Design a binder for this molecule. Sequence first.
Ligand SMILES: CCCN(CCC)C(=O)[C@H](O)[C@H](O)CO
Ligand SMILES: CCCN(CCC)C(=O)[C@H](O)[C@H](O)CO
Ligand SMILES: CCCN(CCC)C(=O)[C@H](O)[C@H](O)CO
Ligand SMILES: CCCN(CCC)C(=O)[C@H](O)[C@H](O)CO
Lengths: 295, 295, 295, 302
Amino acid sequence: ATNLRGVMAALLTPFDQQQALDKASLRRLVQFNIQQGIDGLYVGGSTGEAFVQSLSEREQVLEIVAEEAKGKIKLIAHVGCVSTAESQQLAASAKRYGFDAVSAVTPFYYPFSFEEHCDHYRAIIDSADGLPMVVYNIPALSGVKLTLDQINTLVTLPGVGALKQTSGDLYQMEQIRREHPDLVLYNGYDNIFASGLLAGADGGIGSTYNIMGWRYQGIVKALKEGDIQTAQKLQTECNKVIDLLIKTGVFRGLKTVLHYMDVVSVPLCRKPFGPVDEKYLPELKALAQQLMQER
Amino acid sequence: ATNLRGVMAALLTPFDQQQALDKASLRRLVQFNIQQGIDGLYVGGSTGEAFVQSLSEREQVLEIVAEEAKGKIKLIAHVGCVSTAESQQLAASAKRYGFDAVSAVTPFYYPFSFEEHCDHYRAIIDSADGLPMVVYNIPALSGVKLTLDQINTLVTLPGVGALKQTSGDLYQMEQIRREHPDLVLYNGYDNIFASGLLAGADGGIGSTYNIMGWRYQGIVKALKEGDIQTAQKLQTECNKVIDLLIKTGVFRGLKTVLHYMDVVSVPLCRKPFGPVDEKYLPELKALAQQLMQER
Amino acid sequence: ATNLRGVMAALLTPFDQQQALDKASLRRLVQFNIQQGIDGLYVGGSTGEAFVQSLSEREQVLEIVAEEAKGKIKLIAHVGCVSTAESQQLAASAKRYGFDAVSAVTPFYYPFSFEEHCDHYRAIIDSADGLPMVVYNIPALSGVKLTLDQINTLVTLPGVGALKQTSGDLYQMEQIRREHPDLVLYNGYDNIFASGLLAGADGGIGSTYNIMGWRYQGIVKALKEGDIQTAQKLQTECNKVIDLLIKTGVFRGLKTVLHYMDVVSVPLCRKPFGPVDEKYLPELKALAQQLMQER
Amino acid sequence: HHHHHHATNLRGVMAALLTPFDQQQALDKASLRRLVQFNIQQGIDGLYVGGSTGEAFVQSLSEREQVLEIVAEEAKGKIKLIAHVGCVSTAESQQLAASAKRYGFDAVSAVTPFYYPFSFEEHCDHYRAIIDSADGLPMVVYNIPALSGVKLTLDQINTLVTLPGVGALKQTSGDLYQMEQIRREHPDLVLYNGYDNIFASGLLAGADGGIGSTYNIMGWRYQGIVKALKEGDIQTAQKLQTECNKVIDLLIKTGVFRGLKTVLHYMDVVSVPLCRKPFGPVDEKYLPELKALAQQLMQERG
Ligand SMILES: CCCN(CCC)C(=O)[C@H](O)[C@H](O)CO
Ligand SMILES: CCCN(CCC)C(=O)[C@H](O)[C@H](O)CO
Ligand SMILES: CCCN(CCC)C(=O)[C@H](O)[C@H](O)CO
Ligand SMILES: CCCN(CCC)C(=O)[C@H](O)[C@H](O)CO
């Protein structure tokens, strides 16, 4: 688990104008992240548009990422589905491709009990056969509202080695750090990263790292040097970008920046996501140039 | 839409001890519903555990139900998935198997714009090729919170013949009816059926109809005849049953009652749903006996 | 408390352009409700703008209404404040003025424990010295979310004789009735009144009854006779009005209609409520005329 | 924005003053004077009087004025004084605003009016009417979605805090993206962090101070957090926040206001540690921990 500490980009999954997987742009996105000095990749997550892909499509992506990056950076495979059995098939494939860790969102849509959530995690942990599990918590999207004691139980299940904390409650962040001094604890909301680190997170997983992951590692560095102004200046610049991405749609906006940075051929998300509003293309192109000249 | 008015049971998907589709019990459940005098079946919806099934499993159930019941009662295929493309495949298949209509839940998990929801429905309607669309609204589960104006636009899309209203807001039920005098409008919450018809619904789609559909037909008849005491008494008996099912877990409780009714071989839902707590089996066995005495 | 069953108008408190109480319009509005055939008045509730008045103002209104109506119709005094001691002073004043019952909204703003709520009601009941209590439940405004079990404990407290159920959940409406066969159970949402009565309510307390209370009485009649069609027509007509009142602002729209019916001199609510938008006045004026013609 | 510049002197760490009561639940005046002096000696920059913490919403206007008057007698000119004058009623809030001016307060404040749904424009007029009655005292807009039920957008918050006469925001919200957004839009705005359990994180996000209820019993820790961060000493800032949160953990279990009043009782400041009904008493079993906490706090602050 300890080697899982770090700044991990939640990888986007490129598609073509036919909505098919674009494998050439995936390979390029993987190499691009590595060149920015990212610690690892979180593959097939919410950011990866997991839940509009087939299991087969998810596996193909996991396989290719592993081909490109195994041994060079850490690789966490998000294998979560609503189904335990579907989640187990993806866990076993992650193991076969040599991933360092697996991950699963709290199963969603149907109300499940906390005990059913634990057994779900237990099954996936077994099928991962030695890979540590990152319990993925995102109430805003999943509608699963765990109490702190429930969170505490999840993180001490045999084989759990990390929590992806996609929550803006930095009180809870602090309570988790205080209860589990050694837990790998990822900040999930990009736009509060600096504050999340201050509250007790030791790293993060985020969609925006795909295009400015060096800024987030600047924040970890700046904070560790004790340089608050630089930490704040960097968070502020991240949030200027995040404002625009929320206006445009986050995933399709990030893909569009990556298109102008010559990485992703076609910046589409799968339907029912629609295309970026074309009036936002200048801002997005300019941001691309800004970021390209910056690093 | 006209001939789509009525009481339609939200079909459960039966599974064998290995959590595979139990074909024999499925066919048994279809006929058993028909023998209760239901107007139709709503196949592959939430109640049918669609969201823990693959597209081919969902197709297999649709085909078998068409075999058992095409031309004897009305058949509606819930083909909704998060992905538009996935929902399109299921729609094309429902057409091939000879279904009367298609239906789709508002795509969930990722937040989609309302126009995005509109295109999603347009695309599924094209792929259904003549089959009317039943728009399926369930804020509680889907997390999508439509305004009345947005509901009005959706239900007037070319090819929409109906709205499944799984909401407890009976002001909105009446408003919808007032705006659309001829819309087929299905009450979705079993425990307000009587009240929902009074507010403007002209039928229902429900999970608990699988074991007591004749009660819901009895509520329709009684209200039709100005027979209010009888309506209230039937709704009360339905709610005594619904109290218990909410305690046991609704899908698995229903399947367990059907197991004591000699319809379902193994009353399990798919993981992560767990089993029924052993302490409730006496109560559910009692219930089975009572409903068999009845009729 | 069988004698408290019925359709009670939630009395508006008239004000002048200086924002002081208008006692001449208050007296006129009381007689107007009595002439309309109403069963009682609910005085100084939410509709009565209690929470922008002092205790002395609230007492001045309770006194005037008792002078005007005691012995002619039933009188319920809403005495609730956030403070228990303040609510007791009002409960004592209501007893002195010869009210038939007291009522208190679940105390708000500060989160209080359920037991803290129960003691609150006990103390008010004591100060009321023999006047039955109407527990006033309105989650949407109060922010207090009681479970069914908690509701059951409140309604069986010694000295409670009724429940004002301002909730859209008609399943809970049925469950409360089923548990408490003799409880006086008031429907709080005017726009689901017919459906509320069907689910188990035996009456109502409502703001819109001030201008068309005879319609709600017609709904009770129609449903006692099994005339569902008239009940629906009346509820639909109530809801056309409620749609407009929601656009104009409800209390002030009601007060404006009353101004055109020559009952209220000045149709203002207290600041921070603003005035009705003048573009609505032709509609409010036509409504007044329509309702005056109907009788 | 000129009203923001003029309120620059309001930046700081301000305790949300509790209101002590006697055995009959009337104002305990001796204890209030003690509590006020006790806050001053901790090195607190100021007091926020008659807010949620002060149990305003179970007091009459006359009781709120009495508290305002007494606190001014005790602290005027020595530390900054902000008067929470907010009621649901605009006119009630205006009376309290005028009184606060008469007693020499440095600023007024009003929670967004609650219970009834008001439009945004109706909110703006409410603040404007109260600003008029404050007669030159700057306004601190007090935002607390959790308790108020009022859910303002960022654009609406931007408009509120730039109304003429406004010079500060009390932001009792745990959304630190919005904290940063407010700071970036309003470089000179006084911006108080409202949730004690995230103070250090709120400051990092853009707050330039805080208003809180736990400052009554450990305000020097929050000053310690401000100093640690100014110097770039992250370890000291984190250790102080951690200790504040161990204390907040306990108070959430006991009840926050009554738990604070009890600690202060064991610190010899408050005579009777009750809140007003329908608040109930602290559970007997928590008294050992609360005395223990009082002892630890008097130790570390010698
Ligand atoms: C409501 C905030 C939604 N966000 C934050 C924008 C960066 C997201 O869904 C992000 O993708 C999340 O923080 C993971 O990167
Ligand atoms: C919470 C009430 C249970 N439900 C939902 C089924 C999980 C119902 O009563 C509805 O009738 C359901 O949507 C389908 O019948
Ligand atoms: C949100 C509006 C619903 N209503 C009914 C309007 C007639 C109310 O909130 C009423 O003020 C309430 O039901 C009291 O009659
Ligand atoms: C989730 C923390 C709740 N808190 C923090 C102090 C215990 C509060 O509600 C406070 O009363 C608020 O921050 C004002 O100090």
